Every structure is written in C-alpha cells, then in structure tokens.
From Swiss-Prot, chain A:
This is Nitric oxide synthase 1. Belongs to the NOS family. Its main location: membrane. One of its GO terms (cellular component) is nucleus. Heme b binds at residues 108, 399. GO terms for molecular function: ATPase binding; cadmium ion binding; calcium-dependent protein binding; calmodulin binding; enzyme binding; flavin adenine dinucleotide binding; FMN binding; heme binding. The PDZ domain participates in protein-protein interaction, and is responsible for targeting nNos to synaptic membranes. Mediates interaction with VAC14. The lineage of its organism: Eukaryota, Metazoa, Chordata, Craniata, Vertebrata. Homodimer. Interacts with DLG4 (via N-terminal tandem pair of PDZ domains); the interaction possibly being prevented by the association between NOS1 and CAPON. Forms a ternary complex with CAPON and RASD1. Forms a ternary complex with CAPON and SYN1. Interacts with ZDHHC23. Interacts with NOSIP; which may impair its synaptic location. Interacts with HTR4. Interacts with SLC6A4. Interacts with VAC14. Isoform N-NOS-1 is expressed in brain and colorectum. Found in the Auerbach's plexus of the enteric nervous system. Isoform PNNOS is expressed in the penis, urethra, prostate, and skeletal muscle, and coexists with the cerebellar nnos in the pelvic plexus, bladder and liver, and is detectable in the cerebellum. Produces nitric oxide (NO) which is a messenger molecule with diverse functions throughout the body. In the brain and peripheral nervous system, NO displays many properties of a neurotransmitter. Inhibitory transmitter for non-adrenergic and non-cholinergic nerves in the colorectum. Probably has nitrosylase activity and mediates cysteine S-nitrosylation of cytoplasmic target proteins such SRR. Inhibitory transmitter for non-adrenergic and non-cholinergic nerves in the colorectum. (6R)-L-erythro-5,6,7,8-tetrahydrobiopterin binds at residues 36, 370-371, 384. It comes from Rattus norvegicus.
Amino acid sequence: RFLKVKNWETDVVLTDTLHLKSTLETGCTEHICMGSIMLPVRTKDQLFPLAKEFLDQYYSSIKRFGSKAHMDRLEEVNKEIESTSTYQLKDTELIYGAKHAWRNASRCVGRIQWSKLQVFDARDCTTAHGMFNYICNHVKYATNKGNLRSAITIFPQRTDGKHDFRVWNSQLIRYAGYKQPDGSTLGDPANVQFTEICIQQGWKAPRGRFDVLPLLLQANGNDPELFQIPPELVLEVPIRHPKFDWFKDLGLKWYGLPAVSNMLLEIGGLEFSACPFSGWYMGTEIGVRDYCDNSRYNILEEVAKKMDLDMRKTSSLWKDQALVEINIAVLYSFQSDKVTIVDHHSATESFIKHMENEYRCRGGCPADWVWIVPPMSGSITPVFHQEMLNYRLTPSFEYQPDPWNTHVWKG
Amino acid sequence: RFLKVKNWETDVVLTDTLHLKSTLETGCTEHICMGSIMLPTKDQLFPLAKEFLDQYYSSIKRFGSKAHMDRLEEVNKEIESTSTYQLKDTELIYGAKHAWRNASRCVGRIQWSKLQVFDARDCTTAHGMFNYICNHVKYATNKGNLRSAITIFPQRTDGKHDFRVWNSQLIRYAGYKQPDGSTLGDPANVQFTEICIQQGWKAPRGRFDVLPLLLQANGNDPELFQIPPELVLEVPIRHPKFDWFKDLGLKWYGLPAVSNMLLEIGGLEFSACPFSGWYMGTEIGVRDYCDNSRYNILEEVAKKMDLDMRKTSSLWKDQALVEINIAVLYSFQSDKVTIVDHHSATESFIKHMENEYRCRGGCPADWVWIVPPMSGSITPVFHQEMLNYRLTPSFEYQPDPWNTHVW
Ligand code: HEM
Ligand code: HEM
Ligand SMILES: Cc1ccnc(CCCCCO[C@H]2CNC[C@H]2Cc2cc(C)cc(N)n2)c1
Ligand SMILES: Cc1ccnc(CCCCCO[C@H]2CNC[C@H]2Cc2cc(C)cc(N)n2)c1
Ligand SMILES: C[C@H](O)[C@H](O)[C@H]1CNc2nc(N)[nH]c(=O)c2N1
Ligand SMILES: C[C@H](O)[C@H](O)[C@H]1CNc2nc(N)[nH]c(=O)c2N1
Ligand SMILES: [Zn+2]
C-alpha cells in the first residue's frame, strides 16, 4: 500500500509507506473520524513481541540487523522476561527509544529537532528526594541561562502498576491558580485543582498571579512529596511590547522552559510513567493560548481596552488586533532577553522541511493537522495547506490519567 | 457507538447518537486518520430511495402511515418499470435542505432550513440553464440583502446526458498566464479560463474579469453565456483608517455560489445544483487575498503599512492579514452587502450544533474546515470536539467535467 499526500499551495505530492508499521489504533473507523477528539499492568504474553519489534528497529537503525549482537540481545531479553517478567533497556536503547518517541509524536511541530535530545537516565532513582534532585539538574541543564537545550529525564519504568514513579505536575514549571469566593480566578485557571492539592499537601501559597508551583513527586508508588524548585533555577521573562510602553504595566511574565511532565513514554513494551521532557516555546503557545484562551489568563479585553479598539462589534476584529500585538510582545520580550523562542512562521516552515525529509528517508511522518496548525493565522502558515496522515508509531508518548484520580493513598 | 464530544473551554459535553445513521465511509481506518485530506442499477436504487422516504415521512410525522406506504409502493413500481423515479416537490425541498443540514464542512448551517429551492427539473437546454441561473443570481443577491438558494437541474439518467455547470462557482474572476511568467488575475482559474477562451470567449485580459458561464445540458457539449453585468454585485475594497487601501484596486463579488457539486437525494443524483449563501469575511480576506497561490497580496499591503519585513518574528504577515480582513468586512458593511465575520459565524455554529445535538442527536462537523483560517483559538469552534461522518441527502465533490466529457 502507498498513500499519497498533497500540498495544495505547492502541488507537491508525497508517498507514505511508513503507516504500514502502525499497529496502535486511531479512534477513527470507516464510518466516523475522531480527528478532533482530544483523547481518542502488562503480562509476559504481550511483552516479548513488543520487545522484539523494538529491538529489530533498534538493530536496523544501527545497521546490525541479524548480527550476532542482535540475536544475543533478543535471546537475553527473552530469558529476562521469562525469569523476571520484565527487562531492562541498555543505555543506547533508552536513548534511541526516547528520541524515537519524539520523532513519532504526531502532534509536535518541533520535530526537526528530534535527533538533538539530551537523555538523562534516572533509572537508579528510588525516592522523591532523588527525583527532585534529578529534576533540578534537568531544569538547570535545559535552561542553560536562556540558551535552551532539549532534554528528557527518565525515571524507573512501571513494574506491577503499584509502584509507579509519577510527576504529579502536568509541566515542571507552571503558575498557581486560586479560585476566589466571588467566582473569579487569581493566576492560571488551568491549575486550580492541582494548586488545591498542593495546598492540601502543605504548600504555603503566596496567592499571587504568577506563583511558580512546587513539584509534587511520587516515587515507587509512595504518596507524593512537595519540593520547591530553587527560584534561581526558574528563568522568567517579563512581557513588554516594542512600541506600546503601557504593555509592561499589565504585569505579565512567563517562564522560559516548557517541560511536559505528565506523559507516558512507551519503549519496547516498557512503560516509563515519569519522563519529563522540555524544549523551547513557539510564541503562540504563550501569546495565543496561555494569554488569550477564555479559560486561561484571558487578557484580550484588557489589551484591546488599552489599545482603544472599537470593542462595540466583533467585526471590527478587535480581538484579532489585540491578539497580534500580544504575540508580537512575547516574541520581542523573549528575544530581547536572549531566551530561545520560535515564531509560528519559522516553526511551521521548518516542520514542512522536516516532514518532506522524513517522507524521503523514512517513508512518512505521522502528523496531526488539528494540532500542528498554529492557533492564530492558520492559512498563512505552510502547514495549513499540507495534507497529513495521522497514525501511531512506537516508541511513543501517551496521555495518562492524572495520578490524583488513580493513586491509592497509603497515609 | 454512543459517543461524547466535549468543549474544552466550557466543559459542555454532548452525546452523539446520530452517527448510527451514518452511511457513507470517511477515508479513515482504525490505523490511519485521513481527517486532513481534501478528497478522501435498480438493485441499489430502491434501498437508497426507501431510506430517504422513511426519513421524509418521519420528518412530517406520518411514519408507517398509509400515505408513507403508498408512496414507497409508488416509487418501487416506478424503479422496476422505469429504472429510476421522480421526487415530489415536497421531497426535493426537504432533500435539498437536508443535504445542507448534513454538510459537515459548512459553518453556516444554522441557516439550513431557510433555503429557497428552485426546481429546474423541467429545463432541457443550456439556454434554459442560463435563464434559471440569472434568476437565481438575482433572487439571491436581492440588492445586497443576500438570500440562500439552490437551483436544481434534471437528475442523472444513464450518465451520458448529465447537466453540468462547468464553472466551480457561478461568479469567479479569470486567470491568465503571462509572457512575464507571473499570473494575471486569479491563479486558481487559469485552466478554466483557457477552456473559455478555447470555446470562443473574448477575454478582456484584466485582473477582475467575471468569467462566462459554461453550461452543459442533456450531456451535450457546453455553451458560453455571459452573466448580465448588472446582476453581478461587486464591492470595491477600502480600509476605514488606511486612506491608501483603495489604491490597491481590489474588489470582490458579493455572491458565493458553488456550482460544481453533486446533490444526492434518495439515491438520485443531481449533477448540476448550484447553490449560494453569503460570505464569511475570512473566505475573501484570508484565502482569496492572502493565499500564496491566490491573489497573494500580503507583501504589498505589508509594504504600504511600512512594517518590519526583515524577520518573520515581527509578525508583519499577521498584522497585514488582520487589516485586510478588517477592510473586507468594512467594505461589505458600508455597501450593505450581507457578510458575516468569523467570530459571529462560529458562535452561531456552536449554537446550531447544540440545537442539533438536542433535537436530532448529533451534528456532523469537520473541524479542519469549520475552524477559520485566521485566529483559530479565539473562536469557540477551536475548543469544540466534533465528530465527522457522512449522512445522506448530501452534497459531494465530483470530477471536473472537462476531464470526463467526450467532446
Ligand atoms: C525543540 C522545541 C520544541 C518545540 C518548539 C515544540 C513544539 C510543540 C508544540 C507547539 C506543541 C503543541 C503544544 C500545545 O499546543 O499544547 C508540541 C507538542 C508535543 N511535543 Fe513538542 N516541541 C518541542 C520539543 C519537544 C520535545 C523535546 C519533546 C519530547 C522529547 C516533544 C514532544 C511533544 C509531544 C509528546 C507533544 C504532544 C503533547 C500533548 O499531547 O499534550 N516536543 N510541541
Ligand atoms: C448562509 C451563509 C453561508 C455561510 C456563511 C457558509 C459558510 C461556509 C464556509 C465558510 C465554508 C468553507 C468554504 C471554503 O472554505 O472554501 C462552507 C462550505 C460549504 N457549505 Fe456553506 N455557508 C453558507 C451557505 C451554504 C448553503 C446555502 C449551502 C448549500 C445549500 C452550503 C453548503 C456548503 C457545502 C457543501 C460546503 C463545503 C464545500 C466544499 O467542500 O468545497 N453552505 N460554508
Ligand atoms: C517540549 C515542549 C516544547 C514546546 N512546547 C511544549 C508545551 C506543551 C504544553 C502541553 C499543554 O497542553 C495541555 C493544555 N491543553 C491540552 C493539555 C495536554 C493534553 C491534554 C489532553 C486531554 C490530551 C493530550 N494528549 N494532551 C512542550
Ligand atoms: C454557499 C457558500 C457560502 C459561503 N461560502 C462559500 C464558498 C465556498 C467556495 C468553494 C471554494 O472551495 C474550493 C477552493 N478550495 C477547495 C475547493 C472546494 C473543494 C475542493 C476539493 C478538492 C474537495 C471539496 N470537497 N471541495 C459558499
Ligand atoms: C477540540 C480540539 O481538538 C482541541 O481544542 C485542540 C485543537 N488543536 C490544538 N492544537 C494544539 N497545538 N494544542 C491544543 O491544545 C489543541 N487543542
Ligand atoms: C490540507 C487541508 O485539508 C486543506 O488546506 C484545508 C484545511 N481547511 C480548510 N478549511 C476551509 N474552510 N476551506 C479549505 O479550503 C480548507 N483547506
Ligand atoms: Zn479520522
């Protein structure tokens, strides 16, 4: 089978054969597409196949397919699984695995960078204090005083599902949200429930608009523990605008390091339930979503108010006007402070080049159009006009349930 | 099989039962989503007809009635005897409204029940087709107060006698490839413009030349007609604050009227069914004007605004895009030609989708097409999970006739 994808701007046509390596399911059927749905304890049985399939990929990538080293490693993993019911990855396999989970992440527009990933093997970690130390080193290494470097830290894999390592924060660095008695929210409304859990666990909340949350860390299935990231390790950027002097007085800032901490990394059948990873921002993640979603900081009105836009009718495009200015301000601020950031024009152009290169050398690039297209200015970016095929390859990053829903408290 | 969609901004959760009536296939499988792909006998005819008449009689609350049974029997006899059948006027009107109600890529469906249907099944010649079309254009334009309409020409018989409107829309501008190497006018219309010229059209060779209609009746070779110029309402584009904007020399037409689709009702195929509503501003301001392969005007507008074009991160493109779209909306509003902005349209679509979930058990919606091509996430449709599936009656895309037609 060959599937073709067209670009409607360039008329470039690509042929995908890689989708033939897909096994996981999409959510879609013959009768129903679920492409815009956000969300569409293993035994030995399922395991050796997953292991073998991963190891065959690994050994092909390094041009050693079928070699003695390849065969002995299959043999070795086979026997490890029968004797212990699981197995351990070699460092080189873990690194290759983590790189490929990113390469395979179909909602990631930043994948041109996939092969440049610093992998911190934290599989020797046993306690939450150990996790905290690991995460500080990650944050410091990745921050690099503004010159951001992609990185991932990988904690011990799942065993019986009763001893999971988990980072309870959704990202390593986020701002607290506090729901007020009058129904308004102070700070980030996306973090209210998590902030409540931190408070209940003993965090002394400053109750401001940009309070960096404490890490809440679960090791070996134990109850999680609170730690404050050292403030000197949290790089932040005050947001100002190049032409509008009043913009700074909105009191806005953001942190420099985007670091997803709630996902599951699957490599060769093994499950790494705590695998925080970080890169750098595309400007719209902050300027469009973080600042301008109604359920987030929601600053559009106040900005358009300061700009004296005609707010009487939507068709003055006052929201679109304020939206561009805010996004200009975020890119300007990060740039002036020398904190790595990419704009959505540059990021999407790089992605199309990456995607074409992947079609040529790999036979495809799974891509989720719903997520890859930026949330402003969609059609003046080259990805809008690009047909994409979304399917699931392993190694992979997966969503997992928030741990407060599933954790059995020990006391 | 019983599905939930969530809006992530409002936490509103809707249950879809309507997908169970899904009929056609999507392009997707359990292994590959094709959500972003643009194009993903008497035996079969009776099931198709019954399925339709059942939903018709159910809609008028006479399901299982004597009138229902009698009609089903009537239609059955007609197929076995004549190999096809004819829709009653009421069935045609119902079917056309429902094909619009079912159009998963249409954001304007809150309007679906207010559709004027023109029954042109009595038409026999291209000249007749032209007369019907002018009347459609004039009815729908309504001196700027636009009214939704569809004109339905005779159904396909043996496939050798198709009615087709060769144009993709009733009103579009010509495109000409130049000795220069650049394109004059609308680059999307170069091939069709050459067919017009090949067929006799004397092209003015300008940037905004309304194309002639190329009409095919009873599967004959198509013929050329000019829409009377006084029936084509156009809007000159100016900006409310930039004096220089009008000097770009831009205009657009008021009536968007898609004329290349196939309407399928109860298994019958209406290969010529041009239909029209009114524009959402972004369709012109973002796509017609700013697409690289369309009028591609971003650079020239950016220049007159004196923006910093040295680096993409000044967001000059985004700035210019907003002003072009302000100018479109302003111009149409000033000349009193119906238009809707993308905020207002997507808000109405969210209201429409809620009515539909409550009253019909779902609403098929293609998120990739529903979300406007600028400012995605400040419109409510961005945060709204949607299920896409194919219900009949339906509008379908069909092969350009020049690739099909034996001359
Ligand atoms: C080099 C800098 C990177 C940039 C500019 C970038 C860009 C982005 C953006 C804009 C998104 C969508 C996020 C959203 O809308 O919430 C995303 C998603 C994602 N990226 Fe990246 N990315 C980068 C690096 C990384 C790294 C290092 C990884 C892991 C190794 C990664 C894996 C993912 C995954 C798994 C998603 C989907 C997340 C989800 O489902 O919530 N990306 N990327
Ligand atoms: C009343 C005002 C209407 C508005 C504001 C509107 C809005 C839109 C928009 C913005 C699109 C996307 C088109 C594109 O991006 O190229 C679209 C597509 C479409 N609409 Fe509507 N619509 C209207 C009326 C109608 C009517 C009257 C019909 C049929 C009776 C219809 C059926 C369709 C179909 C079948 C599509 C998809 C066309 C394709 O696949 O190329 N719409 N609509
Ligand atoms: C490494 C990197 C580089 C550049 N940017 C980033 C930022 C990613 C931040 C992710 C925040 O996304 C949050 C907010 N909305 C959906 C949610 C993530 C999510 C939610 C759900 C239900 C499913 C899913 N797959 N992913 C990370
Ligand atoms: C009735 C109405 C109301 C408001 N707006 C409109 C404008 C729709 C104009 C149609 C323009 O669409 C053209 C340009 N890009 C895709 C193409 C239509 C199309 C192309 C293809 C390959 C498949 C498909 N289903 N539809 C029509
Ligand atoms: C409902 C819909 O799938 C949801 O709003 C999606 C759309 N596209 C997105 N794209 C990105 N990058 N991030 C998101 O959170 C979303 N949200
Ligand atoms: C490849 C992708 O499907 C294509 O560019 C789509 C995206 N969304 C669209 N949405 C609308 N309304 N109209 C279009 O023409 C397109 N083009
Ligand atoms: Zn799909």
